[PDB]
C-alpha cells in the first residue's frame, strides 16, 4: 500500500539520520581552531575585456590557461586571449537565449546550450578558416542548464526536467540517462578522475552519480532552498554548494555529512557561482549584491572582497595553474583579477 | 611599437572583429521585442495567425518596423528561474478569453496569473497589452446566460456593454504600480484585422514615453 510504503520510507529516513548523527564525532572547526589565518588578501584588476553588448551568462577557462570563452544574451560566443585582450573568434548562435558554455579539454571543440532544449557543438580547428556547427544534440524536454566535456566524444548534460544525460557526440544518442531528482537540475560538477560527478537541483538536495554504471551513490540534504552552483574540491573527496539563502556549504562523500557552513549576518542575497583555488584554501563566491567574496576553506571568516562590477555577478572561474581569476557580470564586462 | 610581425596582424584581426560586433549590435538594438504570455489556449494561437523546441519565435514587419514575438508557453518548468532573461523587453502581451467566465473557474486562475506576472520584481516598469478575445461568442453567451455565476457581487444588468466594462475594470485594477506602468486594453475577435495597428500605436507610445524619461524631461 502507499501508506505502508511511505511509513517505511520515513522509517528508513529516520534510520539514515540516526546513523549520520552517530558517525559524527567532532566538528572540523574544532580541529582547525588554532591554525594560522591567511590574512587579508588584496587582488587587483589586470585586464578588462570589452566587447559584449548584453548580459554575460557563462565563461570557461581553457586548459592552456591563456584562452577563454564567454557567452552573452546578444547571441554571441567570444573567445579571448587573456594575456593580450585580442578577440580570436566570434561565433553567432542560432538562438540568443543561451545560459551555458564549455571549452573542450583538447581545445578543438566548444559547446553551448540554453532555452531551446538543444546542445550545440562547434568545431574550432578546421580548414576553411572558420567555425562550423559540428553537431546538434536534442532529446531533452526542459531548458538546458549545464554541460561539461568528458573527452572529444562524450559530454554530460543536465536539463530543467529533472534529468541528466551522458551522450555520444559521434552519433547523437542518449548513451546514459540519470534520473532521481524531484526538482529541475541547476548545475553539475565533473570530478578530475572523470569517474563520478555531482549534481545540484532545486529540491535542496545534491546527488553523486557514477558515469559508467549509471546509478546514484549518495544523496546530501543540507540546504532549505534552491542550489545554484557546485564544484569539486581539488583532492576529489569534497565539494561545495551555494544556495539562494545566502549560505555556502562544504560537504564530503567519505563521511557523507556536513563539514562547513559559510554565512554572515550582512549578506541576504543568494550565490550565483562557486569555485575553488589550487590546494583548496580559498573559496570564491559571486553574490547578487554587485560583489564577490573570498572565504577561507578551513575558517568561516572572510578574507577578501572583489568589487568593481555594476550589476549581479553571474559567472566566475579560476585558471588551471591558479594564476588569475576571471569574473563576469550582468554588465557586459569581463574582469581578470590577480 | 615593440610588436612582432604576427602581433600586428592579430591586432588588426581583433579590430575587424570589434567593428563587426559593433555593426551587428547597432542593428540589433533597433528592433522591437514583445513577450507573448497568453494564459492557456485562450486564443493565443490565433492572434499570431492573423498577425503574420521550448521557445517559439515569430518575426514580422509593419511600417518599416521589425517586431520579434517570443512565445514561451511550451516550457512547463519553474517559471521563476528563467523569467529574469526577459528584462528589457518592450511589452508583455496578455491574452484572455471572455467566454470562459462560467467554466476552479478559469477566469479566477487567469486573474491569479495576471496578478503574479504584473507585480513581479523584474516587470516594475514594463507595459502590458491586454487582449480580450472570443467576444462574438461572449455576447450571445451573455444574452443566453447571466454573469452572476462567476461574479457573486455584481449589481449591474445583463447586457454586453456593462458586463464587458465590468470585466475590464476588474482586470485593470490588479496592478500595484499605477504610475510607473500602464495597461492597454482591446476587444478583438477572429474577424478583426486592425490588431496590428493597435499593437503599433501602443508600442510607439511606450517607446516615446521611455525616450522622454531617458532625456531627463520627465
Amino acid at each position: 500500500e502507499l501508506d505502508q510504503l511511505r511509513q517505511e520510507a520515513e522509517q528508513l529516513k529516520n534510520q539514515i539520520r540516526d546513523a549520520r548523527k552517530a558517525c559524527a564525532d567532532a566538528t572540523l572547526s574544532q580541529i582547525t581552531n588554532n591554525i594560522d589565518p591567511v590574512g587579508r588578501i588584496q587582488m587587483r584588476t589586470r585586464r578588462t575585456l570589452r566587447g559584449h553588448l548584453a548580459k554575460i551568462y557563462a565563461m570557461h577557462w581553457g586548459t592552456d590557461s591563456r584562452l577563454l570563452v564567454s557567452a552573452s544574451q546578444d547571441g554571441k560566443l567570444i573567445i579571448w586571449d587573456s594575456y593580450t585582450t585580442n578577440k580570436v573568434h566570434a561565433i553567432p548562435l542560432r538562438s540568443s537565449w543561451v545560459m551555458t558554455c564549455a571549452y573542450a579539454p583538447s581545445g578543438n571543440y566548444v559547446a553551448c546550450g540554453g532555452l531551446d532544449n538543444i546542445c550545440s557543438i562547434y568545431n574550432l580547428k578546421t580548414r576553411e578558416g572558420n567555425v562550423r556547427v559540428s553537431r546538434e544534440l536534442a532529446g531533452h524536454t526542459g531548458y538546458l542548464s549545464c554541460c561539461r566535456f568528458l573527452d572529444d566524444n562524450q559530454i554530460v548534460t543536465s536539463s530543467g526536467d529533472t534529468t541528466c544525460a551522458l551522450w555520444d557526440i559521434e552519433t547523437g544518442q542518449q548513451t546514459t540517462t540519470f534520473t532521481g531528482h524531484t526538482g529541475d537540475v541547476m548545475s553539475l560538477s565533473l570530478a578530475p578522475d572523470t569517474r563520478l560527478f555531482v549534481s545540484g537541483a532545486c529540491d535542496a538536495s545534491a546527488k553523486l552519480w557514477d558515469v559508467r554504471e549509471g546509478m546514484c551513490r549518495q544523496t546530501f540534504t543540507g540546504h532549505e532552498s534552491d542550489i545554484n552552483a557546485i564544484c569539486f574540491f581539488p583532492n576529489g573527496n569534497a565539494f561545495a554548494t551555494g544556495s539562494d539563502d545566502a549560505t555556502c556549504r562544504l560537504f564530503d562523500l567519505r563521511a557523507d555529512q556536513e563539514l562547513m557552513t559559510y554565512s554572515h549576518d550582512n549578506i541576504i542575497c543568494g550565490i550565483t557561482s562557486v569555485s575553488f583555488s589550487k590546494s583548496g584554501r580559498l573559496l570564491l563566491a559571486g553574490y547578487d549584491d554587485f560583489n564577490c567574496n573570498v572565504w577561507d576553506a578551513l575558517k568561516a571568516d572572510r578574507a577578501g572582497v572583489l568589487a568593481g562590477h555594476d550589476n549581479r555577478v553571474s559567472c566566475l572561474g579560476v585558471t588551471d595553474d591558479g594564476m588569475a581569476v576571471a569574473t563576469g557580470s550582468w554588465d557586459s564586462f569581463l574582469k581578470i583579477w590577480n | 611599437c615593440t610588436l612582432s610581425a604576427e602581433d600586428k596582424a592579430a591586432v588588426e584581426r581583433s579590430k575587424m572583429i570589434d567593428r563587426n560586433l559593433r555593426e551587428d549590435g547597432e542593428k540589433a538594438a533597433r528592433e522591437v521585442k514583445l513577450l507573448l504570455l497568453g494564459a492557456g489556449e485562450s486564443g493565443k494561437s490565433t492572434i499570431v495567425k492573423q498577425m503574420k523546441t521550448g521557445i517559439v519565435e515569430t518575426h514580422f514587419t509593419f511600417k518599416d518596423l521589425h517586431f520579434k514575438m517570443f512565445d514561451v508557453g511550451g516550457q512547463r518548468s519553474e517559471r521563476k528561474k528563467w523569467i529574469h532573461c526577459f528584462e528589457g523587453v518592450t511589452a508583455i502581451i496578455f491574452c484572455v478569453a471572455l467566454s470562459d467566465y462560467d467554466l476552479m473557474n478559469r477566469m479566477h486562475e487567469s486573474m491569479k496569473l495576471f496578478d503574479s506576472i504584473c507585480n513581479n520584481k523584474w516587470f516594475t516598469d514594463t507595459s502590458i497589452i491586454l487582449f480580450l478575445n472570443k467576444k462574438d461568442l461572449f455576447e450571445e453567451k451573455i444574452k443566453k446566460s447571466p454573469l452572476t455565476i462567476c461574479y457573486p457581487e455584481y449589481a449591474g444588468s445583463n447586457t454586453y456593454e456593462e458586463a464587458a466594462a465590468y470585466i475590464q475594470c476588474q482586470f485593470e485594477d490588479l496592478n500595484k504600480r499605477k504610475d510607473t506602468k500602464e495597461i492597454y486594453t482591446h476587444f478583438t475577435c477572429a474577424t478583426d484585422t486592425k490588431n496590428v495597428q493597435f499593437v503599433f500605436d501602443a508600442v510607439t507610445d511606450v517607446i516615446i514615453k521611455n525616450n522622454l524619461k531617458d532625456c531627463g524631461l520627465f
Epitope: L67, G129 | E12
Partner: single-chain antibody, 230 residues
C-alpha cells in the same frame, strides 16, 4: 580548397599585364595573401603581401614602387599589376595564403604558379651543410642559423622550415618552433634554446624529402636552396 593562377607568359621588359589568383574552397575574406617568386637559377623570393580587409600592403625593398597588388573579396580573387619589369624577372610565381591569430599556422597552402619569360638592414640566414645524405624512416633533426637571434620578447622560438618537392609546388613542413597545430602530421616537434633551433621528425618519410628553405618572419627572405639527396 584550391588556388588557380592565370596570366604570365612571354613579356617584353617594362610591359603591363594582369596576374590573377582565384581561390575556391575556403573563406577568402579572412586570409592574408602573399606573392612569392622562384627564379630558375635561384631559390624562393618574396614579392608582396596584403592583409584581410585591405588593411596594410607591403612590398620588397628591391621592388618597392614597381608592382602593386589588389584584392577583390566579393569577386573572390587576387590581382597583381605586372608592370615595369626588368630583364631578371623571368621566374615562377606562387600565390600563398596565411592567417594570423594565436596558435595559427600561416603559409600552409600554396598554389601551382605561373611561368614568366622576359626578353633580354635585412636578416640573412645561412646553412652549415649544403648537401646531406638522407635515409627516410629514421629520425631527422633540422636546424638553420641566421644573422640575428629570432626570439622575440614574448619568448617564442620563431622560424619556418619548409620543403619543395621536385616536379610540383612546395608545401609546408613546420611553422615557428615549440608549437604544433592541426593540418600537419603529428611526427613533427619543435624546440628552441635561445640561438639553438631544432625540428625533430621521428618518422622521416619521402614526403619530407626534397629541397628545403629555412625562412624568417620577424621583420621575408628565403634561405639557400639546399636539396638533401637520398
Amino acid at each position: 580548397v584550391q588556388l588557380v593562377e592565370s596570366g604570365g607568359g612571354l613579356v617584353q621588359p617594362g610591359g603591363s599585364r594582369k596576374l590573377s589568383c582565384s581561390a575556391s574552397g575556403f573563406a577568402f575574406s579572412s586570409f592574408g595573401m602573399h606573392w612569392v617568386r622562384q627564379a630558375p637559377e635561384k631559390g624562393l623570393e618574396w614579392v608582396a603581401y596584403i592583409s584581410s580587409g585591405s588593411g596594410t600592403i607591403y612590398y620588397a625593398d628591391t621592388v618597392k614602387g614597381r608592382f602593386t597588388i589588389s584584392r577583390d573579396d566579393p569577386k573572390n580573387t587576387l590581382f597583381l599589376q605586372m608592370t615595369s619589369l626588368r630583364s631578371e624577372d623571368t621566374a615562377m610565381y606562387y600565390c600563398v595564403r596565411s592567417i594570423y591569430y594565436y596558435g595559427s599556422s600561416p603559409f600552409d597552402f600554396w598554389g601551382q604558379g605561373t611561368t614568366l619569360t622576359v626578353s633580354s638592414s635585412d636578416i640573412v640566414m645561412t646553412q652549415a651543410t649544403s648537401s646531406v645524405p638522407v635515409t627516410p624512416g629514421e629520425s631527422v633533426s633540422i636546424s638553420c642559423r641566421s644573422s640575428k637571434s629570432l626570439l622575440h620578447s614574448n619568448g617564442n622560438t620563431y622560424l619556418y622550415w619548409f620543403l619543395q618537392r621536385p616536379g610540383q609546388s612546395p608545401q609546408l613542413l613546420i611553422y615557428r618552433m615549440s608549437n604544433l597545430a592541426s593540418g600537419v602530421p603529428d611526427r613533427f616537434s619543435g624546440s628552441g634554446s635561445g640561438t639553438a633551433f631544432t625540428l625533430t621528425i621521428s618518422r622521416l618519410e619521402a614526403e619530407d624529402v626534397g629541397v628545403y628553405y629555412c625562412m624568417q618572419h620577424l621583420e621575408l627572405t628565403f634561405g639557400a636552396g639546399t636539396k638533401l639527396e637520398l
